[model samples]
Target chain A: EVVKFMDVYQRSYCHPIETLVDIFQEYPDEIEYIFKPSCVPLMRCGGCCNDEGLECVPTEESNITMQIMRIKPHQGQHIGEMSFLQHNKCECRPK
Target chain B: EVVKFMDVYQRSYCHPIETLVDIFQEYPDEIEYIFKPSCVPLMRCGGCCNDEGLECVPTEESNITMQIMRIKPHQGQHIGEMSFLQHNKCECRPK
Candidate 1:
């Protein structure tokens, strides 16, 4: 059976703490919710770079971290399926 | 009686805006929600600093801002009460 719920992202351009507080205040109607770390260091892959006939291996990893905001009324289940991505054009220099 | 609810803060050490976007994207089953500003520049009160007989006043103001988020099912009510704080320890040098 497919379950439906409401999800939110607490992104900030300037002040994060204040921005989040504002979110809680604005949504006075709903119960308070907390942010949980869904995934740590969401990683992305930059395909191997080759020059002439030599292939270059990745030396470091790039990632994006996220926090999941679990709301009241309790949304139970796996949020979603997540995976890494590979960039076609990599600008890493081979050592 | 006061109604209780779950609250969240989208504060980030890095990538604050993207941090929020990731939140919504992570929860696939739930319908996506947007961020709205509840208050801008939440200001605080700073007490006057007097040395000898002359009173030293603060020139710049300090503030914290917030954004309010509304959810589905629409719970109607004020989220909670909030306010600013005044600092008694003024560290401004008298000119």
Candidate 2:
């Protein structure tokens, strides 16, 4: 007896989120203008998968880095990085 | 400008699929018992997310490999490999 499996079509795509942070809460009186490592426009994956509770995921990704500096009462700067899982490719699979 | 974003709860988990293959049409008569690289029970990620079209995905993964061989009219075997992305960890992300 030969049996077969089923595959459904689900849609997914990349989206962005405008993310920002401030040091005012940490030092409301000491810091005026601070450059921080934050998502000016953070990119991510999203969307819906039809049928059987399937979900969308990233098929590819890339790495990214940014800089952070504090220029107010003190001058300090350093290089930092974050995980940038860009949804270069995406699809609704078994997940 | 003070603003806030929204967050929702979604769920995901691992599932299995019983997969098998037969090489009968390929060698209808000369072949009987042969070994092959196929999923006995394929493991994959699945589930759903709540709100804003968010999606569930793998947080961690692992790799795996398998083998295949032929025996009957010709006795031959070789080392072959396949990708097995096991979802060690999963969660709902921006994507």
Candidate 3:
């Protein structure tokens, strides 16, 4: 089944501690989330000298690192990942 | 002066090419934006056994990395950073 994930953002930028604390305090019975490591397909351009073939080569290891937040709703211990959250009519998915 | 930043989210996460293309297409004369590298203060925990001091020593080099999008509105070429974007009554800032 396809799951829908919600991205919650609090005040301040890059300050996880304060954000998390405020979130928990404000929504005491809400869910708690944490970020996890993930990968994605990326293309690397061989600049200057093209010694090796500069192409979009597919690989198991993707250089792009993503921090995905896993959430657990209140009243339940079950945890899930948020797929998309709407922002200004635009869809913001997990990264 | 305090600057307000807007965070625009498109479909999919970690996929820049598709998102950017779609945004530009949809909002042709709206604005264009891109993510830039930024830093933050983070505390590291010395796990397992206590060796040296595992304190929140303030340092210039912060391990945490952030992706901030610089936006350029249409009509003019003045670029600015979006501080916050509203989503589901919640604020989603850049990370």
Candidate 4:
């Protein structure tokens, strides 16, 4: 089980690459991996602590940890892996 | 006047921080500054250059440079600064 950590923004930006890495690292033998970076433009800004708001910076160091879980079943001798492991159902968009 | 540099991603990620820094540095007097980190989630990933495509990583070494400019007006004895300067309407989002 490979676990990772990142912020919500990092999750959106860094997820694609790290996710692909996990796939190949875990299943070097079976299954091919493909990924693409899909998102909107990002802007930079500077403001006072209060003006900047809280979401701008990374959350607590531990809060950004990314957890990877394996979903593939095990076979007799070989491991029957179905899919790679990572985070689930997390939206980068604000509600 | 103050200037800064950053990439698209870094622009979005690091803009607020650096931008605010410029404000204090340049117009140390006049208006107050404030900021916020407004965006969706972000992730970290690793993949082959092919699988990941171009968007994942910073385009060029210098492409990520975030430029900051001052928008304040000039007065006789003092400089009349209205606002801080950054990039134009260039979106980090896809075309």
Tell me, by TM-score, which candidate is best: 2
Candidate 1 C-alpha lDDT tens digits along A8-90? 11122122121112222323453544323211222222222223122323344332222234434365432322222222222
Which model, 1 or 4, shows the larger TM-score?
4
TM-score of each: 0.16, 0.27, 0.15, 0.19
**Between the candidate structures 3 and 4, which one is better when assessed by lDDT?**
4
Among all windows of 10 consecutive residues in model 2 chain B, the one with the lowest summed lDDT is B2-11
User: How well is each residue in B1-95 modelled by candidate 1, as lDDT tens digits?
Assistant: 11111111112111212112222332344353322222222222222222223333334433222223434334443222222222222243545
How do the candidates rank by lDDT, highest first?
2, 1, 4, 3
Residues A1-95, model 2: lDDT tens digits: 11121110111112221112122432356445543322222233443333334555667765433333334425555433323333455565774
lDDT of 3 by residue, B16-93 (tens): 121011222323454444222111122221111111122212122222222232334343332232222111111112
lDDT by residue for model 4 (B17-91), tens: 112222344345636332111122212221222222232332222112122222333422321213323332221
- Where model 1 places Cα greater than 4 Å from the true spot, the runs are A1-22, A32-68, A73-95, B1-95
* Local distance difference test, candidate 2: 0.34
Per-residue CA lDDT of candidate 4, range A8-75, in tens?
22322312121222334444665432211111122222122222223233221211212222223352
In model 3, the runs with Cα more than 4 Å from the true position are A1-90, A93-95, B1-57, B62-72, B78-95
TM-score of chain B of each: 0.21, 0.42, 0.16, 0.17
Ranking by DockQ: 4, 3, 2, 1
Compose the digit string of candidate 2's lDDT tens values, residues B1-95: 11121110111112221112122332356445543321212233444333224444677766544333333436565433333345665565676
Clashes of 3: 7
Q: What's the i-RMS of each model?
A: 22.8, 14.5, 20.6, 20.0
